[PDB]
Amino acid sequence: ASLRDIKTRINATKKTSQITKAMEMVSTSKLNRAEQNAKSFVPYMEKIQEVVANVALGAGGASHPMLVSRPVKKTGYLVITSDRGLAGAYNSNVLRLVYQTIQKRHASPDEYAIIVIGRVGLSFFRKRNMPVILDITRLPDQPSFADIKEIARKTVGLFADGTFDELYMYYNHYVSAIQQEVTERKLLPLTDLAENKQRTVYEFEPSQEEILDVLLPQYAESLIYGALLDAKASEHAARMTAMKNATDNANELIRTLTLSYNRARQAAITQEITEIVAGANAL
Template sequence: MASLRDIKTRITSTKKTKQITKAMEMVSAAKLNRAEQNAKTFTVYMDKIQEVVASVALGSKDATHPMLESRPVKKTGYLVITSDRGLAGAYNSNVLRNVYNTINERHKSKDEYTIIVFGKVGLKFFEKRGMPVVDSITGVSDQPEFADIKEIAAKAVGMFSDGTFDELYMYYNHYVSAIQQTLTEKKVLPLTDLAANQSSLSSYEYEPSEEAILEVLLPQYAESLIYGALLDGKASEHGARMSAMKSATDNADELIRSLTLSYNRARQAAITQEITEIVGGAAALE
């Protein structure tokens, strides 16, 4: 049985750990509020730009663009959004496990796919397994701006345009609530499902032409899809970390209660033993 000193040391250590996890929970809660607002605000923009792109692309039979057309798939690109830090529950492991299993099921050779990674956790995961990472970005802020990821987003879109890969899938955690995040797989390129969520198309007048507008608008739209997923992922990350730290704090409370009970029992046993020895010694002197 542990000594009173050992139990007291564990209680003190657990209380300090609880203070840390409680502070991290509060920090994540504060970050979550802003990240959630950013994601919801950007959704309004994405709905409108999707409606405009769909109207331009589908409203005219003469308008064509390579990003709208499927082609034989020789190589697949995977864009994976993870975090730079851990302590976020299953936030990273769910995405990475799903991507890893998907790649192993779909491809027999490393020449058939390439990976673009957001976050240190994902980068280390793929590098450790010797998987081909063509580009990565780390150190993205908790409240990212589009300028922070414009270069890598434009590069991903450009790699599709120049034929480096023939389709691009994106994996991230979609934010549902502070306690629920849904693993999401989205096909970014080619843009073959523009009409999926459009009940009706608006009519626009184009200047100079549909092709010229699509040449500028489609890359921007694809880059916006990536940025929107990052905002969604950041909200999910803060929610997952807040939930994980809350669970850790609750577990610390339970452990402190258990250790305090053990400490009191051990102290009571020690006192009882001392009283017994005193009574026994007094009886021996009579």
């Protein structure tokens, strides 16, 4: 431990602390911008729940494959991760919980399907030699329903009920800044139909039972969009916490480094002075 070495480490920790604070501020802006997108989709969800709350309970559809029925038997899984690196436990928590649940629910590897958004977290299941069906790597920090429309169209073209009947989606849910909780909710078939209010009767004279086959794909895509927005908000929260901890650790290291530097400088000067005075007195 040399004086100049400690000086170099000190200035390096200075710049690193500045960078971590800057990226923490950037993550703050990202979360602030993403939260309005998260809360602006609730009316569409409530409209879908309103238009569906009188249909399944109204016996409009008999045995539609999406309407509480089993299409062709093939059990799949949905998982969403982050795709910009240093987030903390955001990726690890979901990728661990899904693996633990898979080890008890799934039959054998290389048999079931996985759908991942974010190659950064996808690489875990890649090393876990799982088959990838649909993958999304690059997307804006503020994705829109228009942006997700292409992936939704693929998700209803392939993955459709003629090919796929079960899904389980895994993601991180924004519960608090301290920690973003992970959940496991199935996509299809719908478990039950809850009612938002009393049965607002509508007229279905276009068709009594041919509206389900289009109404329910919208149900699936709306749920997918909801999962995506929850995952993005949770990612931003994870980055918040990780960068705050990084800056705090940097400052804590800095104070001790400065203390050791001062002690070293004092020791060096006192030893040099003693050497000089002894050399002078020796004559």
